[PDB]
């Protein structure tokens, strides 16, 4: 099985840990904001994805740099209901994408919490994050509900196909 290292990052309360355990255990884990990281191995289509869920709190964001090394795919989780912090999520994403160690990393953006009535749609998040300005980077945005699991498998299927063609 091809082993792939994936870094999952984003702001606090974006639902990163809920996505990770929904993929691994099939269940919704009610998570307090992650004050650390989780590492879990998820198997999809004979690829073993080692996913690193790093906490998104302001105190933890400076530590994301330590996880960039040997990252083949980047999953950026955004709370699509949090309109106030979308600009902060854009700045942090752009700061990460400027790092040379992430230059060859494939970007998957999860527009999470699409089940909420005030959630920004995937197109509005694409514009607010400025994803169309990214040159020479393969990116995809998927609308996701971490609680139902909707869109999570479509995002992984895209990631698996991209990482299979990169060799």
């Amino acid at each position: 099985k091809k082993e792939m290292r994936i870094l999952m990052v984003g702001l606090d309360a974006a639902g990163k840990t809920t996505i990770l355990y929904k993929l691994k255990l099939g269940e919704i884990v009610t998570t307090i904001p992650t004050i650390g990281f989780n590492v879990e191995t998820v198997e999809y289509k004979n690829i073993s994805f080692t996913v690193w869920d790093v906490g998104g709190q302001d105190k933890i964001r400076p530590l994301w740099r330590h996880y960039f090394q040997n990252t083949q795919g980047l999953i950026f989780v955004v709370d699509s209901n949090d309109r106030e912090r979308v600009n902060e999520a854009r700045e942090e994403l752009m700061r990460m994408l400027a790092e040379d160690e992430l230059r060859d990393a494939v970007l998957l953006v999860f527009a999470n919490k699409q089940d909420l009535p005030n959630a920004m749609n995937a197109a509005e998040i694409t514009d607010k994050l400025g994803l169309h300005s990214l040159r020479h980077r393969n990116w995809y945005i998927q609308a996701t509900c971490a609680t139902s699991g909707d869109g999570l498998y479509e995002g992984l299927d895209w990631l698996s196909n991209q990482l299979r063609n990169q060799k």
């Binding site: 993929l23 691994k24 255990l25 099939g26 998820v42 198997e43 289509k45 498998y153 299927d157």
Partner: protein, 201 residues
Amino acid sequence: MVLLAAAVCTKAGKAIVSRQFVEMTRTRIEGLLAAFPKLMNTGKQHTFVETESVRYVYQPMEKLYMVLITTKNSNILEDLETLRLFSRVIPEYCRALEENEISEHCFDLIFAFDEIVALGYRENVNLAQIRTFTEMDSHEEKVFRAVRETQEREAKAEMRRKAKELQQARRDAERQGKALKLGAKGKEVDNFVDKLKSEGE
């Protein structure tokens, strides 16, 4: 009434392992352990040494000494029972009472010593309880692991099922385009109290 430290020393006076149960500086405990071999009197029929500040209580173990460092006001009866318990713990981990085996098993000894004494007070433990506590064999952990392995198996089965469905959906999308009573209990205590009252207390 406080056990300060427990140490295993060579007959040459080298401390191999020491565990402290109270807040001591490294310089203080190393000083106390370095003084011990010079303070040891040979040819005496007792196994303690007192300084101005501390008491050493020790037991010879072939080429080694098991040493307890206590306060001068520590209860010697409790300290001797504690010393006997420490001396019985060493052979449970070390087959030979030599410096090399004590050095190889130093962490197992530290873990066993922490089961005997907490904050300078002796725990009510026997050798079999120390063994049980150091083995860490938990029934709850075994049950928790068995439940978690079962959940991981189910999640793996579901993930394989969804992976097949997605791969099939892609292929289909590509295809479609009255006796006299003598003696009352407690009379001795009452007589003692009545004597003390007669003495003005």
